[PDB]
Amino acid sequence: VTAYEEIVCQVFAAVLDRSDVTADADFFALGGHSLLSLRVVARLRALLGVDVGVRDLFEAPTPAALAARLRPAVTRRGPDAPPVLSHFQRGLWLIEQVYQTRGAYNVPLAVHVSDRLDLDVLRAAVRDLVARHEVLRTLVRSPDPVLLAPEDAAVDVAEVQAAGPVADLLAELTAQPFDLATQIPLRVRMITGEQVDGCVLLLVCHHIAADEWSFAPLLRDLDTAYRARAAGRAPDWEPLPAQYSDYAATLHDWLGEATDPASPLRRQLDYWQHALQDLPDELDLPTDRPRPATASHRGGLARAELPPELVEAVRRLAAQHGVTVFMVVQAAVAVLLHRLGAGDDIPLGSPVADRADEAVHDTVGFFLNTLVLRVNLSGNPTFADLLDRVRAVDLEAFARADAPFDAVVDTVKPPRAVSRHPLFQTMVSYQRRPSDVDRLFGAATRLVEVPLDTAKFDLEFAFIEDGGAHIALNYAADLFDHDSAEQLVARLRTVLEHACADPCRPVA
Numbered sequence: 001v002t003a004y005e006e007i008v009c010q011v012f013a014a015v016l017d018r019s020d021v022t023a024d025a026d027f028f029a030l031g032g033h034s035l036l037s038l039r040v041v042a043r044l045r046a047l048l049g050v051d052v053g054v055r056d057l058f059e060a061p062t063p064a065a066l067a068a069r070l071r072p073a074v075t076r077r078g079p080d081a082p083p084v085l086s087h088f089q090r091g092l093w094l095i096e097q098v099y100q101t102r103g104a105y106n107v108p109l110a111v112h113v114s115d116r117l118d119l120d121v122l123r124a125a126v127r128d129l130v131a132r133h134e135v136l137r138t139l140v141r142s143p144d145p146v147l148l149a150p151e152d153a154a155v156d157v158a159e160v161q162a163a164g165p166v167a168d169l170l171a172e173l174t175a176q177p178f179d180l181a182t183q184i185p186l187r188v189r190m191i192t193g194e195q196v197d198g199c200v201l202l203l204v205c206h207h208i209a210a211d212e213w214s215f216a217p218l219l220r221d222l223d224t225a226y227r228a229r230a231a232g233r234a235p236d237w238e239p240l241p242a243q244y245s246d247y248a249a250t251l252h253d254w255l256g257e258a259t260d261p262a263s264p265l266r267r268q269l270d271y272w273q274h275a276l277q278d279l280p281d282e283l284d285l286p287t288d289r290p291r292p293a294t295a296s297h298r299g300g301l302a303r304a305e306l307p308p309e310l311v312e313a314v315r316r317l318a319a320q321h322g323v324t325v326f327m328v329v330q331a332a333v334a335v336l337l338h339r340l341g342a343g344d345d346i347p348l349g350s351p352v353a354d355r356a357d358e359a360v361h362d363t364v365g366f367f368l369n370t371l372v373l374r375v376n377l378s379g380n381p382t383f384a385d386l387l388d389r390v391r392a393v394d395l396e397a398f399a400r401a402d403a404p405f406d407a408v409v410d411t412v413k414p415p416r417a418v419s420r421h422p423l424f425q426t427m428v429s430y431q432r433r434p435s436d437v438d439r440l441f442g443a444a445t446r447l448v449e450v451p452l453d454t455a456k457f458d459l460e461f462a463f464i465e466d467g468g469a470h471i472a473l474n475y476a477a478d479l480f481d482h483d484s485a486e487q488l489v490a491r492l493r494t495v496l497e498h499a500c501a502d503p504c505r506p507v508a
Protein backbone atom coordinates (compact mmCIF):
# COMPACT_ATOMS: atom_id res chain seq x y z
CA VAL A 1 0.00 0.00 0.00
CA THR A 2 1.50 3.32 -1.08
CA ALA A 3 -0.52 5.53 1.32
CA TYR A 4 1.58 4.51 4.30
CA GLU A 5 4.67 5.40 2.27
CA GLU A 6 3.25 8.83 1.48
CA ILE A 7 2.14 9.54 5.05
CA VAL A 8 5.60 8.61 6.36
CA CYS A 9 7.16 10.99 3.80
CA GLN A 10 4.70 13.67 4.87
CA VAL A 11 5.90 13.22 8.45
CA PHE A 12 9.66 13.05 7.82
CA ALA A 13 9.38 16.25 5.79
CA ALA A 14 7.47 18.12 8.50
CA VAL A 15 9.74 17.22 11.43
CA LEU A 16 13.02 17.63 9.50
CA ASP A 17 11.62 20.78 7.78
CA ARG A 18 12.78 19.52 4.37
CA SER A 19 10.81 19.53 1.11
CA ASP A 20 13.11 16.88 -0.47
CA VAL A 21 11.97 13.68 1.26
CA THR A 22 11.49 10.68 -1.03
CA ALA A 23 10.53 7.06 -0.43
CA ASP A 24 14.21 6.07 -0.16
CA ALA A 25 15.56 8.96 1.97
CA ASP A 26 17.24 7.83 5.23
CA PHE A 27 15.75 9.66 8.23
CA PHE A 28 19.23 10.13 9.72
CA ALA A 29 20.93 11.08 6.43
CA LEU A 30 18.24 13.78 6.15
CA GLY A 31 19.46 15.28 9.44
CA GLY A 32 17.41 13.24 11.92
CA HIS A 33 18.62 11.69 15.16
CA SER A 34 17.34 10.19 18.43
CA LEU A 35 15.76 13.43 19.64
CA LEU A 36 13.81 14.12 16.44
CA SER A 37 12.99 10.38 16.13
CA LEU A 38 10.52 10.83 18.96
CA ARG A 39 8.57 13.45 17.00
CA VAL A 40 8.24 11.18 13.95
CA VAL A 41 7.02 8.30 16.12
CA ALA A 42 4.55 10.59 17.90
CA ARG A 43 3.05 12.01 14.72
CA LEU A 44 2.87 8.60 13.05
CA ARG A 45 1.07 7.23 16.13
CA ALA A 46 -1.59 9.97 15.98
CA LEU A 47 -2.07 9.77 12.19
CA LEU A 48 -1.94 6.03 11.48
CA GLY A 49 -3.34 5.03 14.89
CA VAL A 50 -0.89 2.11 14.97
CA ASP A 51 1.65 1.30 17.66
CA VAL A 52 4.83 2.60 16.11
CA GLY A 53 8.05 2.98 18.07
CA VAL A 54 11.58 4.28 17.76
CA ARG A 55 12.35 0.57 17.24
CA ASP A 56 10.60 0.62 13.85
CA LEU A 57 12.18 3.96 12.93
CA PHE A 58 15.68 2.70 13.74
CA GLU A 59 15.17 -0.60 11.94
CA ALA A 60 13.50 1.16 8.96
CA PRO A 61 14.81 4.72 8.51
CA THR A 62 13.38 5.20 4.96
CA PRO A 63 9.68 5.95 4.32
CA ALA A 64 9.49 2.95 1.97
CA ALA A 65 11.14 0.67 4.53
CA LEU A 66 9.06 2.10 7.38
CA ALA A 67 5.83 1.79 5.38
CA ALA A 68 6.56 -1.86 4.51
CA ARG A 69 7.30 -2.50 8.20
CA LEU A 70 3.66 -1.62 9.01
CA ARG A 71 4.36 -12.03 5.57
CA PRO A 72 7.48 -13.60 4.09
CA ALA A 73 9.86 -11.70 1.87
CA VAL A 74 9.67 -12.70 -1.78
CA THR A 75 12.00 -15.61 -2.48
CA ARG A 76 13.66 -15.92 -5.89
CA ARG A 77 12.78 -19.45 -6.95
CA GLY A 78 15.12 -21.65 -8.97
CA PRO A 79 15.98 -21.36 -12.66
CA ASP A 80 13.82 -24.40 -13.40
CA ALA A 81 10.72 -22.98 -11.57
CA PRO A 82 7.49 -22.89 -13.61
CA PRO A 83 5.52 -19.65 -14.01
CA VAL A 84 2.80 -18.71 -11.53
CA LEU A 85 -0.24 -16.58 -12.36
CA SER A 86 -1.04 -14.30 -9.47
CA HIS A 87 -4.70 -14.10 -8.55
CA PHE A 88 -4.52 -10.46 -9.70
CA GLN A 89 -3.70 -11.82 -13.15
CA ARG A 90 -6.44 -14.44 -12.89
CA GLY A 91 -8.97 -11.73 -12.11
CA LEU A 92 -7.81 -9.69 -15.11
CA TRP A 93 -8.02 -12.72 -17.39
CA LEU A 94 -11.50 -13.35 -15.97
CA ILE A 95 -12.95 -9.88 -16.48
CA GLU A 96 -11.89 -10.22 -20.12
CA GLN A 97 -13.50 -13.62 -20.56
CA VAL A 98 -16.79 -12.72 -18.81
CA TYR A 99 -17.26 -9.01 -19.63
CA GLN A 100 -15.67 -8.83 -23.14
CA THR A 101 -13.48 -5.68 -22.58
CA ARG A 102 -12.28 -4.99 -26.21
CA GLY A 103 -8.94 -3.28 -25.37
CA ALA A 104 -10.15 -1.48 -22.29
CA TYR A 105 -7.53 -3.19 -20.10
CA ASN A 106 -4.65 -2.30 -22.41
CA VAL A 107 -2.29 0.13 -20.76
CA PRO A 108 -0.44 2.63 -22.98
CA LEU A 109 2.84 4.40 -22.35
CA ALA A 110 3.71 6.95 -25.03
CA VAL A 111 6.89 9.01 -25.17
CA HIS A 112 7.67 11.72 -27.65
CA VAL A 113 11.29 11.43 -28.76
CA SER A 114 13.11 14.25 -30.55
CA ASP A 115 14.93 11.76 -32.80
CA ARG A 116 13.48 9.03 -34.96
CA LEU A 117 14.59 5.85 -33.23
CA ASP A 118 16.31 3.10 -35.18
CA LEU A 119 13.70 0.33 -35.62
CA ASP A 120 16.13 -2.61 -35.63
CA VAL A 121 17.93 -1.24 -32.55
CA LEU A 122 14.52 -0.72 -30.96
CA ARG A 123 13.54 -4.31 -31.79
CA ALA A 124 16.78 -5.61 -30.26
CA ALA A 125 16.18 -3.52 -27.15
CA VAL A 126 12.62 -4.85 -26.75
CA ARG A 127 13.89 -8.46 -26.90
CA ASP A 128 16.30 -7.64 -24.06
CA LEU A 129 13.48 -6.03 -22.05
CA VAL A 130 11.32 -9.11 -22.58
CA ALA A 131 14.28 -11.41 -21.83
CA ARG A 132 14.79 -9.59 -18.50
CA HIS A 133 11.11 -9.41 -17.38
CA GLU A 134 9.47 -12.87 -17.57
CA VAL A 135 5.99 -11.39 -17.10
CA LEU A 136 6.38 -9.82 -20.57
CA ARG A 137 6.83 -13.21 -22.30
CA THR A 138 4.23 -15.17 -20.32
CA LEU A 139 1.24 -16.28 -22.40
CA VAL A 140 -2.03 -17.27 -20.74
CA ARG A 141 -4.04 -20.19 -22.12
CA SER A 142 -7.52 -21.40 -21.19
CA PRO A 143 -6.13 -20.26 -17.06
CA ASP A 144 -2.56 -21.61 -17.48
CA PRO A 145 0.62 -19.53 -17.77
CA VAL A 146 3.09 -20.49 -20.49
CA LEU A 147 6.51 -18.86 -20.18
CA LEU A 148 8.09 -18.36 -23.59
CA ALA A 149 11.84 -18.73 -23.56
CA PRO A 150 13.63 -15.63 -24.90
CA GLU A 151 14.31 -17.42 -28.21
CA ASP A 152 10.65 -18.28 -28.85
CA ALA A 153 9.06 -14.98 -27.74
CA ALA A 154 8.43 -13.11 -30.99
CA VAL A 155 8.30 -9.45 -29.96
CA ASP A 156 5.85 -7.22 -31.88
CA VAL A 157 7.72 -4.03 -32.88
CA ALA A 158 6.72 -1.89 -35.85
CA GLU A 159 6.75 1.58 -37.33
CA VAL A 160 3.40 3.24 -38.07
CA GLN A 161 3.07 6.33 -40.25
CA ALA A 162 0.48 8.84 -39.08
CA ALA A 163 -1.64 10.31 -41.86
CA GLY A 164 -4.32 11.60 -39.48
CA PRO A 165 -3.65 13.29 -36.14
CA VAL A 166 -1.30 11.48 -33.76
CA ALA A 167 -3.32 11.40 -30.53
CA ASP A 168 -6.29 9.56 -32.06
CA LEU A 169 -3.86 7.12 -33.66
CA LEU A 170 -2.29 6.47 -30.24
CA ALA A 171 -5.72 5.68 -28.77
CA GLU A 172 -6.42 3.35 -31.70
CA LEU A 173 -3.17 1.37 -31.42
CA THR A 174 -3.82 1.17 -27.67
CA ALA A 175 -7.30 -0.34 -28.04
CA GLN A 176 -6.23 -3.19 -30.36
CA PRO A 177 -6.85 -6.45 -28.44
CA PHE A 178 -4.22 -8.93 -27.38
CA ASP A 179 -4.73 -12.63 -27.77
CA LEU A 180 -2.80 -13.75 -24.69
CA ALA A 181 -2.75 -17.41 -25.73
CA THR A 182 -0.52 -16.63 -28.74
CA GLN A 183 0.95 -13.09 -28.34
CA ILE A 184 3.23 -11.76 -25.60
CA PRO A 185 1.44 -9.04 -23.58
CA LEU A 186 3.57 -6.21 -25.02
CA ARG A 187 3.26 -4.26 -28.28
CA VAL A 188 5.68 -1.53 -29.37
CA ARG A 189 4.95 1.08 -32.02
CA MET A 190 7.12 3.90 -33.30
CA ILE A 191 4.89 6.51 -34.90
CA THR A 192 6.39 8.80 -37.54
CA GLY A 193 4.89 11.27 -39.96
CA GLU A 194 5.06 14.66 -41.65
CA GLN A 195 3.27 16.06 -38.59
CA VAL A 196 5.67 14.39 -36.13
CA ASP A 197 9.08 15.71 -35.09
CA GLY A 198 11.17 12.64 -34.41
CA CYS A 199 8.75 9.91 -33.37
CA VAL A 200 6.30 8.90 -30.68
CA LEU A 201 7.28 5.63 -29.01
CA LEU A 202 4.17 3.73 -27.90
CA LEU A 203 4.39 0.79 -25.53
CA VAL A 204 1.12 -1.06 -25.09
CA CYS A 205 0.96 -3.67 -22.36
CA HIS A 206 -1.86 -5.95 -21.52
CA HIS A 207 -2.75 -5.11 -17.91
CA ILE A 208 -2.03 -8.72 -16.95
CA ALA A 209 1.66 -7.83 -17.31
CA ALA A 210 1.90 -4.19 -16.17
CA ASP A 211 0.35 -1.64 -13.85
CA GLU A 212 1.06 2.09 -13.98
CA TRP A 213 3.95 1.73 -11.52
CA SER A 214 5.74 -0.30 -14.21
CA PHE A 215 6.24 2.76 -16.43
CA ALA A 216 9.46 3.79 -14.67
CA PRO A 217 11.18 0.37 -14.85
CA LEU A 218 9.88 -0.21 -18.40
CA LEU A 219 11.40 3.08 -19.60
CA ARG A 220 14.57 2.80 -17.50
CA ASP A 221 15.27 -0.70 -18.82
CA LEU A 222 14.24 0.07 -22.41
CA ASP A 223 16.54 3.11 -22.41
CA THR A 224 19.40 0.99 -21.03
CA ALA A 225 18.87 -1.79 -23.58
CA TYR A 226 18.42 0.73 -26.41
CA ARG A 227 21.69 2.56 -25.72
CA ALA A 228 23.62 -0.70 -25.30
CA ARG A 229 22.23 -2.11 -28.54
CA ALA A 230 22.99 1.12 -30.42
CA ALA A 231 26.63 0.49 -29.39
CA GLY A 232 26.40 -3.14 -30.59
CA ARG A 233 26.31 -4.91 -27.22
CA ALA A 234 23.88 -6.52 -24.81
CA PRO A 235 22.89 -4.33 -21.84
CA ASP A 236 24.90 -4.76 -18.64
CA TRP A 237 22.24 -5.93 -16.22
CA GLU A 238 22.34 -7.65 -12.85
CA PRO A 239 19.39 -10.10 -12.88
CA LEU A 240 16.14 -8.87 -11.24
CA PRO A 241 15.98 -9.66 -7.47
CA ALA A 242 12.62 -11.33 -8.23
CA GLN A 243 10.48 -12.28 -11.21
CA TYR A 244 6.75 -11.70 -11.12
CA SER A 245 6.14 -15.45 -10.68
CA ASP A 246 8.35 -15.29 -7.56
CA TYR A 247 6.02 -12.64 -6.15
CA ALA A 248 2.93 -14.62 -7.13
CA ALA A 249 4.10 -17.85 -5.47
CA THR A 250 5.04 -16.04 -2.25
CA LEU A 251 1.73 -14.18 -2.24
CA HIS A 252 -0.31 -17.34 -2.86
CA ASP A 253 1.50 -19.26 -0.13
CA TRP A 254 1.04 -16.51 2.45
CA LEU A 255 -2.63 -16.00 1.54
CA GLY A 256 -3.50 -19.68 2.08
CA GLU A 257 -6.99 -21.06 1.54
CA ALA A 258 -10.38 -19.49 2.19
CA THR A 259 -11.42 -22.66 4.07
CA ASP A 260 -8.65 -22.13 6.69
CA PRO A 261 -10.03 -19.82 9.44
CA ALA A 262 -6.54 -18.64 10.40
CA SER A 263 -5.41 -17.91 6.83
CA PRO A 264 -4.90 -14.22 5.99
CA LEU A 265 -7.26 -14.77 3.06
CA ARG A 266 -10.27 -15.98 5.08
CA ARG A 267 -9.53 -13.45 7.79
CA GLN A 268 -9.48 -10.60 5.27
CA LEU A 269 -12.57 -11.94 3.50
CA ASP A 270 -14.46 -12.05 6.78
CA TYR A 271 -13.59 -8.40 7.30
CA TRP A 272 -14.86 -7.50 3.83
CA GLN A 273 -18.06 -9.52 4.33
CA HIS A 274 -18.95 -7.41 7.37
CA ALA A 275 -17.61 -4.19 5.86
CA LEU A 276 -19.69 -4.58 2.65
CA GLN A 277 -22.93 -5.67 4.32
CA ASP A 278 -26.06 -4.10 2.79
CA LEU A 279 -24.09 -2.52 -0.03
CA PRO A 280 -26.10 -0.68 -2.70
CA ASP A 281 -26.25 -2.53 -6.00
CA GLU A 282 -25.36 0.78 -7.66
CA LEU A 283 -25.42 4.50 -6.93
CA ASP A 284 -28.24 6.70 -8.23
CA LEU A 285 -26.11 8.77 -10.62
CA PRO A 286 -27.15 11.24 -13.37
CA THR A 287 -26.79 9.31 -16.59
CA ASP A 288 -27.73 10.44 -20.07
CA ARG A 289 -28.85 6.93 -21.06
CA PRO A 290 -30.03 3.82 -19.25
CA ARG A 291 -27.58 1.04 -18.51
CA PRO A 292 -27.65 -1.13 -21.67
CA ALA A 293 -28.09 -4.92 -21.74
CA THR A 294 -24.41 -5.50 -22.59
CA ALA A 295 -21.48 -3.18 -21.88
CA SER A 296 -19.67 -1.85 -24.93
CA HIS A 297 -16.74 -0.57 -22.80
CA ARG A 298 -16.65 2.40 -25.15
CA GLY A 299 -15.55 5.53 -23.33
CA GLY A 300 -13.99 8.97 -23.41
CA LEU A 301 -11.67 11.07 -21.23
CA ALA A 302 -12.53 14.53 -19.81
CA ARG A 303 -9.59 16.39 -18.27
CA ALA A 304 -9.84 19.13 -15.64
CA GLU A 305 -6.67 21.19 -15.50
CA LEU A 306 -5.64 22.20 -11.98
CA PRO A 307 -3.77 25.50 -11.39
CA PRO A 308 -0.42 24.82 -9.67
CA GLU A 309 -1.97 27.09 -7.02
CA LEU A 310 -4.76 24.58 -6.36
CA VAL A 311 -2.30 21.66 -6.55
CA GLU A 312 -0.26 23.33 -3.79
CA ALA A 313 -3.38 24.16 -1.74
CA VAL A 314 -4.61 20.55 -2.01
CA ARG A 315 -1.22 19.32 -0.78
CA ARG A 316 -1.37 21.73 2.17
CA LEU A 317 -4.94 20.74 3.02
CA ALA A 318 -3.83 17.10 3.05
CA ALA A 319 -0.79 17.78 5.26
CA GLN A 320 -2.77 19.94 7.69
CA HIS A 321 -5.36 17.19 8.28
CA GLY A 322 -2.89 14.29 8.22
CA VAL A 323 -4.28 12.64 5.09
CA THR A 324 -2.91 11.82 1.68
CA VAL A 325 -3.80 13.81 -1.42
CA PHE A 326 -5.61 10.70 -2.61
CA MET A 327 -7.89 10.86 0.44
CA VAL A 328 -8.77 14.48 -0.31
CA VAL A 329 -9.69 13.51 -3.90
CA GLN A 330 -11.68 10.53 -2.66
CA ALA A 331 -13.53 12.70 -0.13
CA ALA A 332 -14.28 15.25 -2.85
CA VAL A 333 -15.58 12.59 -5.27
CA ALA A 334 -17.79 11.27 -2.46
CA VAL A 335 -19.11 14.79 -1.87
CA LEU A 336 -19.69 15.29 -5.58
CA LEU A 337 -21.75 12.11 -5.97
CA HIS A 338 -23.49 12.90 -2.68
CA ARG A 339 -24.57 16.30 -3.98
CA LEU A 340 -25.77 14.64 -7.18
CA GLY A 341 -28.24 12.45 -5.21
CA ALA A 342 -26.27 9.24 -4.65
CA GLY A 343 -27.18 9.12 -0.94
CA ASP A 344 -25.08 8.90 2.23
CA ASP A 345 -23.37 5.55 1.48
CA ILE A 346 -20.78 5.94 -1.30
CA PRO A 347 -18.82 2.84 -2.34
CA LEU A 348 -15.75 3.94 -4.37
CA GLY A 349 -13.38 1.43 -5.94
CA SER A 350 -9.76 2.22 -5.63
CA PRO A 351 -6.61 0.34 -6.74
CA VAL A 352 -3.96 -0.34 -4.11
CA ALA A 353 -0.47 -1.44 -5.09
CA ASP A 354 1.07 -4.46 -3.32
CA ARG A 355 4.65 -3.23 -3.87
CA ALA A 356 5.95 -3.01 -0.29
CA ASP A 357 8.55 -5.78 -0.77
CA GLU A 358 11.84 -4.26 -1.93
CA ALA A 359 12.19 -7.14 -4.42
CA VAL A 360 9.16 -5.82 -6.37
CA HIS A 361 8.84 -2.20 -5.18
CA ASP A 362 10.34 -1.24 -8.60
CA THR A 363 9.64 -3.98 -11.17
CA VAL A 364 7.34 -4.73 -14.12
CA GLY A 365 4.10 -6.48 -13.30
CA PHE A 366 0.53 -6.08 -12.15
CA PHE A 367 0.42 -5.42 -8.39
CA LEU A 368 -2.92 -3.61 -7.96
CA ASN A 369 -5.66 -5.02 -5.82
CA THR A 370 -9.02 -3.33 -6.07
CA LEU A 371 -10.62 -2.26 -2.81
CA VAL A 372 -14.11 -0.96 -2.12
CA LEU A 373 -13.77 2.15 0.04
CA ARG A 374 -17.19 2.69 1.61
CA VAL A 375 -17.60 6.39 2.41
CA ASN A 376 -20.41 7.36 4.78
CA LEU A 377 -21.62 10.95 4.61
CA SER A 378 -24.43 10.73 7.19
CA GLY A 379 -25.02 13.44 9.77
CA ASN A 380 -24.09 16.65 7.93
CA PRO A 381 -20.28 16.33 8.26
CA THR A 382 -17.93 19.13 7.42
CA PHE A 383 -15.22 18.37 4.86
CA ALA A 384 -12.64 18.11 7.65
CA ASP A 385 -14.92 15.65 9.44
CA LEU A 386 -15.20 13.72 6.18
CA LEU A 387 -11.43 13.63 5.77
CA ASP A 388 -11.27 11.99 9.20
CA ARG A 389 -13.93 9.44 8.21
CA VAL A 390 -12.18 8.73 4.92
CA ARG A 391 -8.82 8.25 6.68
CA ALA A 392 -10.44 5.80 9.11
CA VAL A 393 -12.18 3.87 6.33
CA ASP A 394 -9.05 3.76 4.19
CA LEU A 395 -6.68 2.63 6.96
CA GLU A 396 -9.14 -0.10 7.96
CA ALA A 397 -9.23 -1.09 4.27
CA PHE A 398 -5.48 -0.96 3.63
CA ALA A 399 -5.09 -3.43 6.49
CA ARG A 400 -7.07 -6.00 4.44
CA ALA A 401 -5.65 -5.21 0.98
CA ASP A 402 -4.59 -8.76 0.08
CA ALA A 403 -7.96 -10.45 -0.34
CA PRO A 404 -8.37 -10.50 -4.14
CA PHE A 405 -11.26 -8.42 -5.32
CA ASP A 406 -12.83 -11.35 -7.15
CA ALA A 407 -12.83 -13.34 -3.90
CA VAL A 408 -14.48 -10.36 -2.19
CA VAL A 409 -17.13 -10.27 -4.92
CA ASP A 410 -17.68 -14.02 -4.40
CA THR A 411 -17.90 -13.60 -0.61
CA VAL A 412 -20.28 -10.63 -0.73
CA LYS A 413 -22.43 -12.31 -3.44
CA PRO A 414 -23.97 -9.12 -4.88
CA PRO A 415 -26.74 -9.03 -7.51
CA ARG A 416 -24.80 -9.44 -10.79
CA ALA A 417 -25.28 -7.86 -14.27
CA VAL A 418 -22.86 -8.08 -17.18
CA SER A 419 -23.40 -4.37 -17.84
CA ARG A 420 -22.54 -3.19 -14.31
CA HIS A 421 -19.27 -3.60 -12.46
CA PRO A 422 -20.00 -5.28 -9.07
CA LEU A 423 -19.67 -3.56 -5.61
CA PHE A 424 -18.75 -0.21 -7.21
CA GLN A 425 -19.14 1.57 -10.50
CA THR A 426 -17.01 4.64 -9.71
CA MET A 427 -13.29 4.34 -9.14
CA VAL A 428 -10.92 6.92 -7.65
CA SER A 429 -7.16 6.69 -8.16
CA TYR A 430 -4.06 8.81 -7.58
CA GLN A 431 -1.28 8.33 -10.13
CA ARG A 432 2.23 9.79 -10.45
CA ARG A 433 4.00 9.66 -13.81
CA PRO A 434 7.74 8.79 -13.93
CA SER A 435 10.31 11.45 -13.21
CA ASP A 436 13.58 11.91 -15.12
CA VAL A 437 12.36 10.62 -18.46
CA ASP A 438 13.29 13.82 -20.29
CA ARG A 439 16.52 12.60 -21.95
CA LEU A 440 15.88 8.91 -22.82
CA PHE A 441 17.52 7.10 -25.76
CA GLY A 442 20.11 9.88 -25.98
CA ALA A 443 17.41 12.29 -27.19
CA ALA A 444 15.04 14.86 -25.69
CA THR A 445 11.94 12.99 -24.48
CA ARG A 446 8.54 13.76 -22.89
CA LEU A 447 5.59 11.54 -21.96
CA VAL A 448 2.45 12.10 -24.07
CA GLU A 449 -0.99 11.35 -22.61
CA VAL A 450 -3.14 8.91 -24.58
CA PRO A 451 -6.84 9.81 -25.08
CA LEU A 452 -8.67 6.60 -24.20
CA ASP A 453 -11.53 5.33 -26.36
CA THR A 454 -12.54 2.78 -23.71
CA ALA A 455 -13.70 2.70 -20.10
CA LYS A 456 -13.69 0.04 -17.40
CA PHE A 457 -16.44 1.31 -15.10
CA ASP A 458 -19.26 3.85 -15.15
CA LEU A 459 -16.79 6.56 -14.04
CA GLU A 460 -13.09 6.60 -13.15
CA PHE A 461 -11.66 9.78 -11.62
CA ALA A 462 -7.85 9.87 -11.62
CA PHE A 463 -5.74 12.54 -9.92
CA ILE A 464 -2.66 12.40 -12.15
CA GLU A 465 0.61 14.10 -11.22
CA ASP A 466 2.79 14.56 -14.30
CA GLY A 467 6.08 14.31 -12.36
CA GLY A 468 1.80 19.90 -11.83
CA ALA A 469 -1.37 17.81 -11.90
CA HIS A 470 -4.74 17.30 -13.56
CA ILE A 471 -7.91 15.28 -13.07
CA ALA A 472 -8.89 12.77 -15.77
CA LEU A 473 -12.45 11.40 -15.81
CA ASN A 474 -12.65 8.20 -17.88
CA TYR A 475 -16.38 7.68 -18.44
CA ALA A 476 -18.56 4.99 -20.01
CA ALA A 477 -19.88 6.47 -23.28
CA ASP A 478 -22.85 4.09 -23.02
CA LEU A 479 -23.98 6.15 -20.04
CA PHE A 480 -22.64 9.70 -20.34
CA ASP A 481 -22.24 12.22 -23.13
CA HIS A 482 -18.86 13.89 -23.31
CA ASP A 483 -20.24 17.24 -22.21
CA SER A 484 -21.90 15.66 -19.16
CA ALA A 485 -18.44 14.28 -18.24
CA GLU A 486 -16.69 17.63 -18.77
CA GLN A 487 -19.27 19.08 -16.35
CA LEU A 488 -18.71 16.37 -13.73
CA VAL A 489 -14.96 16.78 -13.78
CA ALA A 490 -15.32 20.57 -13.60
CA ARG A 491 -17.66 20.14 -10.62
CA LEU A 492 -15.05 17.95 -8.92
CA ARG A 493 -12.48 20.76 -9.22
CA THR A 494 -15.09 23.12 -7.72
CA VAL A 495 -15.56 20.78 -4.75
CA LEU A 496 -11.78 20.71 -4.27
CA GLU A 497 -11.52 24.52 -4.61
CA HIS A 498 -14.14 24.99 -1.90
CA ALA A 499 -12.48 22.40 0.35
CA CYS A 500 -9.12 24.15 0.36
CA ALA A 501 -10.80 27.52 0.98
CA ASP A 502 -12.96 26.43 3.93
CA PRO A 503 -12.79 22.77 5.02
CA CYS A 504 -15.09 23.59 7.95
CA ARG A 505 -18.29 23.93 5.91
CA PRO A 506 -20.75 21.01 5.66
CA VAL A 507 -20.72 18.89 2.50
CA ALA A 508 -24.50 18.95 1.90
